[PDB]
Amino acid sequence: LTPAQALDKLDALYEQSVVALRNAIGNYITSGELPDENARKQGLFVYPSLTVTWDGSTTNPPKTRAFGRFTHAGSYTTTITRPTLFRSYLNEQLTLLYQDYGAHISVQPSQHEIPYPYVIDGSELTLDRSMSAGLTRYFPTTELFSPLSHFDARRVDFSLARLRHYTGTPVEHFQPFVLFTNYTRYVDEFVRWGCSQILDPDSPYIALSCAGGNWITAETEAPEEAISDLAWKKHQMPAWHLITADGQGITLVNIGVGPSNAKTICDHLAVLRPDVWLMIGHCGGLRESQAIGDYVLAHAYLRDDHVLDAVLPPDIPIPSIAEVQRALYDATKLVSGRPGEEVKQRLRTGTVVTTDDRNWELRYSASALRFNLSRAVAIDMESATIAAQGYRFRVPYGTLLCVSDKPLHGEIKLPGQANRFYEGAISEHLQIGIRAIDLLRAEGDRLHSRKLRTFNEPPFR
Amino acid sequence: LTPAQALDKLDALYEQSVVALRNAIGNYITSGELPDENARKQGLFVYPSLTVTWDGSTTNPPKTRAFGRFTHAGSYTTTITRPTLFRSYLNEQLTLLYQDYGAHISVQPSQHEIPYPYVIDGSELTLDRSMSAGLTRYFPTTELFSPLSHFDARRVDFSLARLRHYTGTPVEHFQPFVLFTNYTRYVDEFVRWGCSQILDPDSPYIALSCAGGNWITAETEAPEEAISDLAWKKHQMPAWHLITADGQGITLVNIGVGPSNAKTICDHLAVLRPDVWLMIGHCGGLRESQAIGDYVLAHAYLRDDHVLDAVLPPDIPIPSIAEVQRALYDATKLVSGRPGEEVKQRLRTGTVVTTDDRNWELRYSASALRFNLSRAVAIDMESATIAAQGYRFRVPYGTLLCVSDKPLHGEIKLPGQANRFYEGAISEHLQIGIRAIDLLRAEGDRLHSRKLRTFNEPPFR
Amino acid sequence: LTPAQALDKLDALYEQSVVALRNAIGNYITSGELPDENARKQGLFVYPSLTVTWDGSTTNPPKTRAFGRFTHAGSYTTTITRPTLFRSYLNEQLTLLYQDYGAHISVQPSQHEIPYPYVIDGSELTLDRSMSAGLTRYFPTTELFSPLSHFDARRVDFSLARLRHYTGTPVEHFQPFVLFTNYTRYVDEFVRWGCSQILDPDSPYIALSCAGGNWITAETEAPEEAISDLAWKKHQMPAWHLITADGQGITLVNIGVGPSNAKTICDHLAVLRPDVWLMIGHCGGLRESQAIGDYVLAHAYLRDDHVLDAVLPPDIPIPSIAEVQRALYDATKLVSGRPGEEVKQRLRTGTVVTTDDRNWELRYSASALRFNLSRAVAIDMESATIAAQGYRFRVPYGTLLCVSDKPLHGEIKLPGQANRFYEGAISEHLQIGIRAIDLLRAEGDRLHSRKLRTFNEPPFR
């Protein structure tokens, strides 16, 4: 079986099962009819399954490439979902393993049923007690030789549902390059620059999906509902996507403050397999020489976030992705005016402490030791978590914070309070992040390295 | 008081006390005479003391520079030893604080006596029980307003004695750029290249200090005792210095194998305030695609060495020094350069696991999890220790290992055993290290950054 | 099957497989021929397997003996290697279980192939890239109901190779009684006393195997290459065997300094199933009343070596072997001249602290508490490791250190420096170790006790 072919068989098998499940649900709701256990065991409500086999015999196997490689010979499989949504990714990936390795592709019904909630489109069914009990009782509900991809169908549906809920946006609009912010003013500045881009006929940005629903295009009357206020009330982590024809835009998610959110948003965004995600937010400057408005390029993290300790012990080193670091560094040179070495007065490269204690100041003495020991340069509440998650899910990551205050030097400022020097910097900061993406986007495929690969790294990126 | 002046008063005061102490000892040995408690309280056997004061008022204080800065106004002091040995360092450092900050320098007897063992140039004499007891009883011995430098006189004398004992070399010969190796063949290759350098009249290298005593210069008859075999029996960590007129050569220490030595050697070498130290050694390749002879540039370390856990918890991040990484990376291109390929096929940048268990293979299953979790790319026994020490003592550091075998893929070769492809890579490997040093040396003062500075970082480099 | 019989069938089966594997390798090198998967599944490249069954019915089973016993009835098996090398051991052991328990012995091809590296005699092969790839690809490589012995064939071959590499000696020359030293001068003193023994026609010592290769016998011209200097450069842990006709001589290994080495050397030496290994080295005296040159008999260890914490938690008690303690104690009386209770002025029995931090002095305050809490009497860097390994591998062990300095009382000397008093004790010290061995050797089989036996202790010693 070939790429284009496999994609089509996946599409078919999928549509078939979702349509089939919707039907069964309809019948149970109208007449009270149940599906016959026989047709189900035949793959009635089942996700398509994708398997790629490799004999292990290839003259010059790519051993330098980051993704799309085989560690050993054998069969790699996985359940698939939303083939249409992942069409590009699935194609691009199957193609690599098909040519460079000459692999055997095969599509066929799996043994996993699509939980009914993931096939119900419009609005949640609002049946009564008995109706519901009957549904979760007689229908596929959600439950708690080698992997072809990082996540299986159920894991992906679970996260696609969450991404939409948390984001107030359709997962089809998400772009490959993500920016995470911990301050409301960043989306304001982003939407503005965005709308602006849409109008300029030279900019590739042709649309702007907004948290809440609004879809803004070149010809939209009064582009003011771009930042509907009802969004921050309805969605915990509003997103805004600046789409381009080829889907190479920039997605911005305002994750809010805290490691919980940083963790959560990444758990789900990961399934979309982003090309990179950057942390563009404010932080506390811990060094006396630092000035509000200065930038901090994280090169290491002191993980005081707790949120990921179980799955990734604190003694496991989270490195920096050289490519991403260059991008952030160069972007700070270009965007911060002074072209050259004078950046060292505005930019500081160092270790950032990420904490889950918003009132850490109340316990400075107790933290002081580690702050010094780690040679901490700034303190925030999302960085390390974003990095760790990027690391865990093989998504290139980077952190470029902006000093919004100096907790240790009498200047404790809060986000939102009058702070001309920070506030003044917000637009430039967002531009540094955007320029960094431009640089990385230009670096084409060179972006991904092998610093995130595991021994049992799946063939798919 | 000025730089040149301070240096001279330090020299004077020092020589005075050592001569005074040697005298007192001689008198006690010949007649049995003791020194008068009065002259001692007057600074008879005392190290010179160096104090530098800063009012805190300077128009444009250097706030970007890594070393030679003042965090606050006040008086910084420290005991001094071997002013002649540190003449250059002391001058260069006092000069900075004298001009850029206009500081008040003052030299005067301290309250610390020079332990008699540090003034006795000759090893052992012939003292019997009583004689000794008398010495340690009536003379000064080692007993176990802000810091001007990282180490005080006693700490420095302690380490200088050790450096010499372990190295089989005079501390005066040590050069600013250090190379650490874990394999005997590296010194062979180094001494060869060195002697060769000496002969070439264009090479800055004019002398080669050898572990054991041998001093080789342009006009030396039969330069064969360069690598005296008795050296590896007499010294645990033989060193070889390739001196240049201006003392900017390359020092190579063969630290042997194990974290204990790596830690120990750095504890002492740190007082000489090197400009950088690189780990040039062999390692095991943990990845399938790696080939014996390939290089590994460490960008993070999984610390399984235990040796530094107490003073530097495993959860404190040890970053990479961007400058050092570039140097190592570019040097690999230049020295390994092959028209028709990317270095990415010979060089791998990743996380290295440093262990204190030579037979870790006997416990693979138990380690496997962390290896994977850390995305380990190679395993050695010195890297992390060297890096952590560099980090702790503010000495730029870097690691560029050479795959000597693949433990996880049927090729468990040992250093010494036949290894067609490793042994054949050793000379090129050492050259990559040497080239990296050249690049860093050229980068002049730009080499030191602020990634190793603490909040209470001492004025001196 | 009987003892002598089993031995011969093991010899046969073994030689056959090694010869068979050598052949296959030769054919692959000359023509490119591969072995037929069929003959291999028939035990072509397989280690002999030894199985001993016991019905559990014996009138008066030895329940006091330390080794050669059955905890339960059933079948005990194990792969065998180098039957000729272990001829004596294997015989002595099978004989016990054959008579005292009347067991059913059976020898036959196992399911484990001998990794090709272990059959290649001369030097490690040095073929090119493809050749090698082909070898590790098509040939047996080293991959990482009840046990008859402590180690299986593969584990034993692994260690025999290491023992030779580290020791610079053939495993055949290793003697039952081992002495470990951490100071070069001890081997000097040993080789001397050894060459002397060889000449005296009453001494059982007839040969001296030397690290590096030298074989010295009664009639050897100029016995000066006994301590070839090139040894300490080629071998990390040089050994010297003083062989006797009946192979009951004394083996001395200079393990160097550090817990890593101590651990490593024991991991391998253990497969030769020594009768006992003693730690004969220098240490720091922590008690004011101690004098340089005094002896320390360890009766407990404060394990600060980290190196074995995983396999043997620090809270697991490592006891003293009464027999070995007496031997060390009595030997100190005899060799140290004045016996009776006077020994109490030269010998101190107490708890020793073994650390992996050579510069523990720089952190005395942090250690002081535990030193006191453990009533520490001396500090070294190998003891506990050697002891623990002895404990782990059921090899009787003991520690008799010699105070080379007093860190806490002014004299912080260095074994390798001018220490008139320590240097003078060295020869006597080595003799105490040698005498202790003589005493234990005389104690015949009574030497082994049950303090090292586990619940699932293997039948073989």
Short mmCIF file of C-alpha atoms in Angstrom, two decimals, chain B residues 35 41 113 128 163 193 197 203 223 254 384 397 400 408 455:
data_model
loop_
_atom_site.label_atom_id
_atom_site.label_comp_id
_atom_site.label_asym_id
_atom_site.label_seq_id
_atom_site.Cartn_x
_atom_site.Cartn_y
_atom_site.Cartn_z
CA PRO B 35 59.94 31.93 68.59
CA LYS B 41 51.49 38.47 67.31
CA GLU B 113 50.09 32.30 60.11
CA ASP B 128 62.18 11.92 64.93
CA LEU B 163 48.66 20.09 42.45
CA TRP B 193 52.72 17.38 18.76
CA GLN B 197 55.74 22.71 17.97
CA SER B 203 55.11 28.27 16.91
CA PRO B 223 63.83 14.76 23.63
CA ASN B 254 45.71 12.96 32.42
CA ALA B 384 29.76 15.79 34.63
CA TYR B 397 34.09 24.25 30.78
CA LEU B 400 33.93 16.71 23.60
CA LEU B 408 24.59 -1.59 24.04
CA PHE B 455 24.80 36.83 43.65
#
